[PDB]
Structures are given as C-alpha cells and as structure tokens.
Design a protein around this ligand. Structure first.
Ligand SMILES: [Mg+2]
Ligand SMILES: [Mg+2]
Ligand SMILES: [Mg+2]
Ligand SMILES: [Mg+2]
Ligand SMILES: [Mg+2]
Ligand SMILES: [Mg+2]
Ligand SMILES: [Mg+2]
Ligand SMILES: [Mg+2]
Ligand SMILES: [Mg+2]
Ligand SMILES: [Mg+2]
Ligand SMILES: [Mg+2]
Ligand SMILES: [Mg+2]
Ligand SMILES: [Mg+2]
Ligand SMILES: [Mg+2]
Ligand SMILES: [Mg+2]
Ligand SMILES: [Mg+2]
Ligand SMILES: [Mg+2]
Ligand SMILES: [Mg+2]
Ligand SMILES: [Mg+2]
Lengths: 259, 74, 207, 157, 61
RNA sequence: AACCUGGUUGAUCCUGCCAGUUACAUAUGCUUGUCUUAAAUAUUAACCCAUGCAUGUGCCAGUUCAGUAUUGAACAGCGAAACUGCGAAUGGCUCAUUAAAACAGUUAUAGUUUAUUUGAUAAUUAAAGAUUACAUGGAUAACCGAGCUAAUUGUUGGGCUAAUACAUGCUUAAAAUUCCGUGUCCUGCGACCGGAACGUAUUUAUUAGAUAUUAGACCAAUCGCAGCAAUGUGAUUGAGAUGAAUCAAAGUAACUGAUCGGAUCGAGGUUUACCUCGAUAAAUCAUCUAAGUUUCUGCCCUAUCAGCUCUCGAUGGUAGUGUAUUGGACUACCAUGGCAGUCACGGGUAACGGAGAAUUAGGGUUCGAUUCCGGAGAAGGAGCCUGAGAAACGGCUACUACAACUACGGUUCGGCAG
RNA sequence: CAGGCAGGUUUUAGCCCGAAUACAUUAGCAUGGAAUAAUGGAAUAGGACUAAGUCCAUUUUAUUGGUUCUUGGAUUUGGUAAU
C-alpha cells in the first residue's frame, strides 16, 4: 500500500465507541499512543459523545487547546483530539475535578466510571514483559506502556500491580493463578469479572484460561485477555454496571420488565 | 459571562445577533490570488496580499473586543 | 532497479508465474561491490576506500571497495590487533575472487605477524624469530620475570604449523565480515581443524 | 578428514570452538553445538555424537521452530538432506454433501541425525524459509512399512 | 460523491398468478370493505402478516 | 402462497419442448399532483483533452533592521515576504491486468523496517588535533541594484545581515576489571606500590550466561568463605525471559570513529544568592502505527491442453554476494531433482477476490465494476531523486504514441481512471 | 422506508433509560465422547510385567578425576501371567 494509513471511517470505527452510524463519514482516528487502536477511546469521543461536555467538533478544539488545561489522564495534562485513553485509566476533568475509570461494559462498550478522590489515586497496571537491561538493572513493563525501574523481584511476567499515581509508587501486586479475580480486556467475553479456575498452558503457541463468578458461570478465554482485577476474591476497583456480570437476554428482561 | 459567550460562540451565531456582521464571498478571489502568488517571487507577493478580501481573524477580534467594553449591564 | 522479488521465477511445478505489480521499491537490489586489496599500490595510490550507502530505516551502511588493512584475532590466545593483510588465497566460492584478490566474508588470507609476534614476545618472552635465539628474558631471576616462565611452561605447544607461520612473516587467517555491508574486513587466525585442511587445498592446489 | 572436507570447502559449527579447545588440555574438548527446540520434542542421540555440519538442522543450529507442526508420509529420499512428504486429506463438497481425496506435497529438510527411508511417517516443524520450497524441518521420524507404491498408499494419518 | 446508507425495503408483494378469478374477487370485496384505494395496499397487508407467521414458524422450529 | 396453463388427435393417454406466468437488472415508449429518500460514463475506450478548482501550512515558544503603530536603546502588539520545519507516500477515481496469483479465514517473524506518539535511559566527549564555553566560525535567501530571452512558479550576475540551516566544538567522581614495570615482600601470575586502558555504539574473536525438568556418597587436586599458617569450613548466595536461542545483562582482546552524550526557544514569578511550568532538537530500549515477506485451506469454463520445468535455475546441497531481513533473490561449485488423472503444464473468461446482492419449502441457480477491506494502476512501459515512507505519479529521466506556446532558436507545474 | 434515539420540569443548574441478541457451514486452534468407518498392537518372533547381573549414556553432588549413584537405553538370564 502507498505508505501508512492516516484516516478512519465512520463505518469502520469500533462498536465500542457506540458511534453515530448516520453521523458523518469518518471518525477521529486514535493517535499512536499507550493503547492500541481498537482498544482505546480518543478524547474527542470521550467528551463529545461520552460525557457530552463538548458537542460540535470545534467544541473540543477549544477545550484541549484552551490555555487553561481541562483534561488530565493519569495525573498528566493532555491536549490531543485523539489521545487513546485505554483500559484501567484515570481521567480527570480539571474544571470540575471529575475522576473517571476507562473500563469496558459487560456488553463491551467503553464506560466511564466515576471515582472518589480516593481511587483516583491508584490505577491498576498489568505486566507486559519483564527482563533485565543496562548495567545489571531490572525492568518491568505495563500494558499502559509503563516502563518500570527496580521493581519488586517477586513479580512474574503475567502480573497485575496497584499503582499509586500520586507517588508513582507500587503497592500490593498479585499474579494470575488458580483463585483470583479478573477482568477480561477483550474478547467474545469482555467486561466480565470472575474467579480464575485454572490456567492450562499448551505452549504450541496459545494458552487458555477458565473462570467462575456471581451466578457461577463458566468462562473461557486466552491469557492475553485476562487482567487481574484482584487477589483472592476481593476486587480492587468499583465496577460499572453493578458487578462485572452480564445477563441472558432472558435475565435482562426479567430484571427490567420482570417477565 | 457575555465575555465568555463572545469567545466561545461561533462566528456565524454572532452575525446572527447582528454583532459580528457580514460573511463576504472568499472562495473565488482567494482561489485567484493563489493563482498569482503561486507564480511570483516575494517582491510582489507581499503587495498582492495587501489586497485579499478582508475579514482577518485579527479583525474579528478587535470587533469582538469592541462589543466587550461598550457593553455592560444586567 | 535490480530487484529480487521471487515472482520472476517458476512455481514448484515450473509453470511460469503471473505479475500485476510493477517492480516495487522495497525489493531493492544494490549493485554488487567487489572488494580488492592495496597490498600492491602498483597503480592504486589511495590505500583504502569505503563508500557509505543510504539504507532503508534511514541508516547508513558502509561499503568496502578497496582495502589494505583489517583486524584479526588469534583464537587460542584471545588476542586481537589491527594488521596489514597480504595476499588472498583460495576463496572457495570461486577462484576468480582470488585472481582479483576480492574480499568475501569467508575468504582465506595472509597477515603480518608483527603485532602477534610483538605480543607473544612481551607476554611469554618468546620472539618466534628464527628458532635459535628462541627466548629473550631478563638478567636476574628473582622478581616478576618469574611469570614469563610460568606461562612459557604452559607447554605452549603452538602447533608446528603456527610456528612456521610466524617466522615466515606470513600468517593464515579467514575473514568474518561483509565488506560490502559494513565496510570493514575482520578475520580469525587459522588453526587446527581448518588450518590443516585449507593448507591442503593450497599444497595440492599448486602441486 | 571426511565429514569435514567431503567436496565442500569447509564445515565448522555455529559455536566456533575447535582449534582453541587445545587451550583446555584436560577436561572435555570435543564440543559440538548442543540444543533443544523443546516443544515436547526429544533431542536425537545421534544428533549429539555426530560429525555432521548441517546449519539447517534444528539441533545443530540457530534455526528455530514456530507455530505450524506437521505429520505426513514421506514420498522421496532423493535430494541432499531434503525430502518430500505427502499429506492425505478429504475435501467436502457443499452440493453433493460428500468428499473427494486430495494431497498436498511438502518440502521438508532433514538433519543428518535421523535416518530416512522411503514411505515412512514423519513429523515436521515450522522453520524459517530455507529455500524456494523448504519451510519445514524434520523433528521426529517414525519408520513404517508400505509394500510397494507410495502413491497408492493413502492414509488419513 | 454519493454514498447513502439509509435502508431500502419494499412493502409490496407481487402475486404469481396474475389473474386468479377467486383471488381478485377477495381483494375487491376487501378493498370495498375497508375503503382501500389500490390492490397494492392489500398486498402491503399480506406482506406484513407474513413477517409474523414466518417468524412464528421460525420459532416453532 | 412445496400451485401451473395453451399448442402434437377424428377423439385418447404419454415423453417432450415452444409459449405463457414470475422476479430482477440496464435500455426505452407513453403518462406524470404531493411529501420522505436517492443511485447516477462501469459496461462500448484503462480512448483522447481546452478550461477553472482538486495541498498546503506559523504558534506565547526556529530566523523579522520589510510594513504598520513615534514602539522595554539590543529585540518586546499586529504582522508579508524569504531561509527553516513538517506535509505532500492520506485521501479521491478506477478495474485494464490478475485463477493458488490476488484474496479470505488462519499462522510466523528466533527472518525484518517503521517519521509522528506514549513510558524509560544515560557521571565519563574517543586518539592525533585543537581548545571560548559566560558559548566559536564561515556563507546565502528575502532586500538594494545591473541584465538576458518572443517565450513559462526560467535565471545570470554584483552588494547587504539571522538562525534549531550550515560548519566546529569545551566539559575533573570513586571503586572494580584487565594489562604493564627486570618496584618491594612472597612465592598464589599472591599481596602492597607505581604506570596504562575503561562511557555508548560500530566490527569481529573469545570467556561465562549454571534447559532452578534434573537426589546423593567417598579419597585425591583445584576453588572459594574465615584465612599469617595450622586446621578448617562450605559447596553455599546464585539463575531476568521463552515451548526453545549463538536471548536479555556481562568479562577479555582490538577495530571504526560517518552512533549518541543540547553553542537552541518561551512564558509566569521574584531584593539577591534566582525560582516555577513549558517548546524543541536528538541517541538506544520499549510502545504505539503500518509495512514487507510467511504457514495452512479454498476458486469459474477447458484435454479438439498430457506430459511440464532444466543453456542457465528447474528442485536440493554447499560457500559468498545483496537486502530491512529470510530465500537460487543473484554469483560460483556440486547433486539431479521439483509437478502431475487426488488433472500437472497450457488455453478462455464481457473474471480484480471478499464483506455481500436477486429468487429459495429443503437442496440449489445467477451475480457481484460499484460506500467496508485487501490488491492493482494512473496514456503504454522501463529507470530514479528524495524520504521514516513510494518505482510515487495531481514529482523527475529516456523511448513509443500524443497534448499546449513559438519571433521555429526554444519552452511547458504537459496526462481529468479527482 | 427508517434513524438509534428518546422518556419526565411537577425533585431540574438535575432525573430515568438505550445502542442488546442470533447465524456465520469450509481450514486452522482448546476441549467432552462410549456409535459407524478407517487405522494399529505380541507370529520368523517376539512381546508383556517383574528381579538380579553386565555394558553404553547421563542430571543434581562447587568443579575435575576415580569409584558409587539417580536417570534413560542395550542385552543375558530367572520368575510371573490361561503367555
Ligand atoms: Mg492527530
Ligand atoms: Mg510465541
Ligand atoms: Mg474563512
Ligand atoms: Mg533513525
Ligand atoms: Mg480402499
Ligand atoms: Mg403423433
Ligand atoms: Mg386439430
Ligand atoms: Mg392416428
Ligand atoms: Mg419460458
Ligand atoms: Mg497459497
Ligand atoms: Mg552574492
Ligand atoms: Mg594500581
Ligand atoms: Mg523574564
Ligand atoms: Mg547463506
Ligand atoms: Mg490461465
Ligand atoms: Mg466472478
Ligand atoms: Mg477501494
Ligand atoms: Mg495483506
Ligand atoms: Mg471527469
């Protein structure tokens, strides 16, 4: 192909953005950042269609360009129409001191969870890779594309850390092993939260995992899609749509219109 | 603050309250100046530019500003 | 646009194979770069010449066209000094490369023993010049000179082939570097397995 | 003198020890490149105490194996350390609701270690492109007997 | 540059037999009973009734 | 709505077709009051083209002695040119080519490149040289002025000054490690002493990375932990990552030095010694993005296509080239293979493949130029500059056929499948 | 048609609720399985299980030897089994 793509089509932009089909023809294309294209929510989407603080396109252009700084992502200022806010992030709306979790539904739509000045401090990080680099030093990396220097050594590659944004400090981690709580970042099963049952590795190039939860449903997904929302039953963050558990179309009806 | 309203609202909503004014036909001429300029050396270009249909943003502001001082009330 | 697309071939079953794509730029194929030697400036003044080529990523790749000095390492001892290469002999790939003293990654050549001779002398007290004067030590045997012994006694049984080499001034070694790629020419000094062998190619080659 | 020269003009290893080994004049000097692709595969005894210098081997080289792993019958023994395996599968036919027979032929590389034979089942791994066709290396060989035509032989192995 | 995306759909249904004595008779007796205007309308209705039964059968399966 | 009816006889019962019947596509005839919605030179020429537009861009934060306004006396508002920097390789149109090729669903990259982004990381500026770092050097647009041609975003030529352009460059850690001196003591290449090397990267050679799947024992030697020795002790601390590494990190030896290690820019504060938040340049690792190449499986007619590929590659092995890297991708040498009736090879296709579209009891039949995706191409064909990125093509070079101007010397920012 | 909105100002500088779901055959992956179907195991013999002996190879024992030993493999023998 000519070179590298550079736009994005209304029609082609992820169902996670709950986008306007009739809308236009395009859609703000996520900027190369911390999260992958599909797994992200560009700010313009976050304020216009989400919060609804903005509206028309120029509305954003003001907000992120205005010399006041109205948007914060993980304790930092952002002024990019399409910064890819990803899973388990913390976004603050300066002018109102609003704090949000970037989390998927139970139906897989990006949801905004309101946090208390309390959780707004800690953010959950999942461990990408772990190896030693320059001059005998250990480095850990998080999905959030965080690069960590001198990390606690009791941390295996597929771990989950709790991060104190305020001090850029770590605390209480927890690997994925039979008996923990987890969130699935993507898949025919995303947005779910349950107890890890067991992890059968097949090495041939793809390991799998099982899970249980509230109504004790059986879940199946690939490791790469498991995010440890916590150690031993206690979750670490407040979940959207009540608990991370979806209902039969049948259970939804009976709960709402009670059929 | 009407002083906020004046900074945020769109240029088109302002001419609507009869505060900003006109919306003259830029297209045609701008396309024609491109014509000449694209074919000249700085010397004249500057001169030409001193003739492209008005309505600078710098101009939009001074007019926005005037509504600012001259208005006060409620 | 000397390309290298595998399209101008014939699939397994030798039937010609179709094309709809003009040669695309990423199938680049740069002009070969034969590499000669200045161990004979009879004409060639400018000793060594290396031209840098602008490669993909944006990097540069230095290309060796003409040379005269490379770097070599003595396997056994773990020594490595920059020396002057002499004449190329037996290129394996083809004998023409030898006829044009061209430098292939694996071209077997000769070098100046000087740096190695100089070193083997300082660390063992053995010059390797014609056999008789063999050693050259100190006058008094009380202090640190006691080490040149300890090492020398390490039954430095340097193959009967390594020995002859030094004295003759010439040294056998093969190269390990793409001149047309990095611009340099580095090689290891020949020994045991291959030495014995490559030499054979040379004994029988001429005889 | 044989495994080394044998026509070709030299045959070392990836781990250039050799001649230098004469430095460790006491322990074991005769080192050869040792490896283990793992993936639930035993490393051939013959592979270790061999004199063979095959760079295209999965135990004697920096040749990896990844993803696709195959089992198929062998067709030909000719070619230098390369063999053709034939796989026999059925294809379904939407309309008639039935199947037909079909066979894909595969270029496989064989490290000297295991000994070939024509008409035996073989296990190939997914190794990087080694040539126009080759893209599979043998990792586990099972000897088998077929009395005659290898072509006639068709087994949903 | 025309790229519509709204959706089509025909409310109609043409009948196979174009001159069924018995069928036309009902369509007219119907148009006169419900103050209809054209035979179309009548088919518009049949077509609707269809979607229901086709979905009933689909579910009974 | 799983329906059918007319026509072979003087009548009859049959196969059987023609016909009707139906839907849907472009065409077209006649006829047209509303509202909502809307395709639209694809087919026949991927045939040709006037004309106009279709790609440009500047902040508080790369250069303003233009001009305005009589403005911090170096310059501070607005604000063109012009040197700088990015972009121009997105999109938009088209389907001519193209049947395991492209495509799709899958897989690999331990065989690779990726400007812009996000996270992190740098104590040592190499030698010779040279040397200011309170910081270096030289030149040129814009401008002033002279000029050529019938001619175009042609350009000669003289004079003037700035950069994140260009060019050149200053920067004390200790320890450790390695090696050297006929240095002391002692014999362990041991200890103290003195000298030398020492960032990173580049290029090789070599040492060790202890497949924490994998228990232990005795005598000798070495080894290391106490150690003057004696005698011991102890074999322990250890082991980031993978299914797997000639991985990650590391020791020694030397090579290149065209890798990097900031001679740059704001604003807000504040009685000092300055302070605070930013811009931007740029190296490596990640990261994002995308791209090469790749595993497996699947395509319409056709043998009045059966043997095909192999003088130069056809199949495999060797060594090298070359590339971003793998590879016969190309060279050389060697072996003779590779495919096929489970249809090779060859030919046709008004054939770009999918997602899908029309009718449908079930099974099927026929289409997919055409909003999504992937591919290919820009008059045909080859070549290339530049760049992180295209063989680009709203960039360049030559040929074939053409389009525009001419004072016939020569010229064109000449390619509407936008 | 169809868009995916919208519902209540009588808590209105705010309230309630939505953007669900299914099908996706062909080839690949994980996985439960007893039928049909194909395929296979001990017939030259040899196999099987077990004990000992011997030989080759080998992990942890600091490391190198030498023994031993664990662990694989090779044989000979004897025992067991409705061989
Ligand atoms: Mg952007
Ligand atoms: Mg893997
Ligand atoms: Mg305007
Ligand atoms: Mg670069
Ligand atoms: Mg049969
Ligand atoms: Mg008759
Ligand atoms: Mg009649
Ligand atoms: Mg008759
Ligand atoms: Mg008919
Ligand atoms: Mg294929
Ligand atoms: Mg001048
Ligand atoms: Mg010292
Ligand atoms: Mg100031
Ligand atoms: Mg090679
Ligand atoms: Mg054909
Ligand atoms: Mg078709
Ligand atoms: Mg397209
Ligand atoms: Mg592709
Ligand atoms: Mg047109």
């Amino acid at each position: 192909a000519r070179g590298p793509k550079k736009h994005l089509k209304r029609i082609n932009a992820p169902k996670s953005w709950m986008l306007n089909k009739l809308g236009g023809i395009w859609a703000t294309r996520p900027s190369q950042g911390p999260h992958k294209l599909r797994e992200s929510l560009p700010l313009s989407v976050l304020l216009k269609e989400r919060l609804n603080y903005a509206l028309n396109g120029r509305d954003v252009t003001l907000i992120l360009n205005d010399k006041e700084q109205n948007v914060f992502v993980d304790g930092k200022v952002r002024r990019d129409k399409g910064y890819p806010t990803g899973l388990m992030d913390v976004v603050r709306i300066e002018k109102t001191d609003q704090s949000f979790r970037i989390l998927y539904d139970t139906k897989g739509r990006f949801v905004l969870k309101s946090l208390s000045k309390e959780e707004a401090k800690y953010k959950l990080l999942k461990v990408t890779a772990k190896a030693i680099g320059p001059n005998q030093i250990p480095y850990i990396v998080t999905h959030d594309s965080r690069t960590i220097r001198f990390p606690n050594p009791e941390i295996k590659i597929g771990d989950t850390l709790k991060y104190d944004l305020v001090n850029n400090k770590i605390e209480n981690f927890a690997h994925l092993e039979s008996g923990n709580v987890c969130y699935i970042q993507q898949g025919n099963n995303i947005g779910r939260v349950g107890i890890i049952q067991h992890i059968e590795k097949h090495q041939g190039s793809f390991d799998i995992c099982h899970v249980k939860d509230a109504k004790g449903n059986a879940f199946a997904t690939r490791l790469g899609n498991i995010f440890v929302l916590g150690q031993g039953k206690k979750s670490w963050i407040e979940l959207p749509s009540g608990d991370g558990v979806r209902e039969t179309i049948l259970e939804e009806r009976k709960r709402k219109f009670s059929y | 603050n009407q002083q906020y309203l004046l900074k945020y609202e769109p240029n088109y909503r302002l001419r609507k309250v009869k505060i900003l004014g006109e919306k003259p036909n830029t297209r045609r001429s701008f396309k024609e100046l491109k014509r000449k300029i694209k074919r000249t050396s700085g010397k004249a270009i500057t001169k030409l530019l001193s003739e492209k249909k008005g309505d600078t943003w710098a101009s939009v502001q001074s007019k926005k500003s005037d509504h600012l001082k001259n208005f006060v009330a409620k | 646009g000397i390309s290298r697309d595998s399209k101008h071939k014939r699939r397994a079953t030798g039937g010609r194979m179709p094309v709809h794509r003009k040669k695309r730029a990423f199938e680049k194929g740069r002009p070969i770069s034969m590499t000669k030697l200045t161990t004979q400036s009879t004409t060639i003044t400018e000793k060594r010449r290396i031209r840098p080529v602008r490669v993909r990523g944006g990097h540069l790749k230095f290309r060796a066209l003409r040379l005269c000095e490379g770097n070599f390492s003595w396997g056994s001892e773990n020594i490595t000094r920059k020396t002057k290469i002499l004449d190329v002999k037996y290129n394996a790939t083809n004998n023409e490369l030898v006829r044009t003293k061209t430098l292939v990654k694996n071209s077997i050549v000769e070098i100046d023993s000087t740096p190695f001779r100089e070193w083997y002398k300082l660390h063992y007290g053995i010059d390797l010049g014609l056999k008789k004067d063999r050693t050259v030590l100190g006058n008094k045997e009380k202090s640190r000179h006691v080490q040149k012994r300890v090492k020398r006694t390490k039954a430095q049984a340097l193959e009967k082939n390594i020995e002859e080499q030094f004295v003759s001034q010439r040294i056998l070694a093969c190269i390990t570097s793409r001149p047309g790629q990095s611009g340099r020419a580095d090689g290891y000094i020949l020994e045991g397995k291959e030495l014995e062998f490559y030499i054979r190619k040379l004994q029988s080659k001429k005889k | 003198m044989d495994t080394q020269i044998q026509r070709a003009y030299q045959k070392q290893d990836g781990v250039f020890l050799n001649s230098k080994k004469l430095l460790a004049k006491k322990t074991s000097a005769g080192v050869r490149y040792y490896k283990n692709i793992g993936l639930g595969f035993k490393t051939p005894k013959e592979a270790i105490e061999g004199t063979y210098v095959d760079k295209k081997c999965p135990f004697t080289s920096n040749l990896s194996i990844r993803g696709k792993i195959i089992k198929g019958l062998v067709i030909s023994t000719k070619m230098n350390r390369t063999v053709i395996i034939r796989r026999d599968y059925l294809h379904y036919v939407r309309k008639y609701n039935r199947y037909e027979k079909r066979h894909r032929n595969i270029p496989v590389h064989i490290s000297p270690c295991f000994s070939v034979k024509e008409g035996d089942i073989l296990v190939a791994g997914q190794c990087r492109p080694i040539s126009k066709t080759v893209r599979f290396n043998a990792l586990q060989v099972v000897p088998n007997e077929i009395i005659g035509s290898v072509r006639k032989q068709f087994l949903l192995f | 540059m025309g790229k519509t995306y709204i959706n089509t759909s025909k409310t109609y249904s043409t009948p196979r037999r174009p001159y069924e004595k018995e069928r036309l008779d009902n369509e007219m007796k119907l148009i006169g009973t419900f103050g209809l205007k054209n035979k179309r309308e009548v088919w518009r209705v049949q077509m609707i009734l269809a979607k229901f039964r086709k979905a009933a059968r689909e579910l009974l399966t």
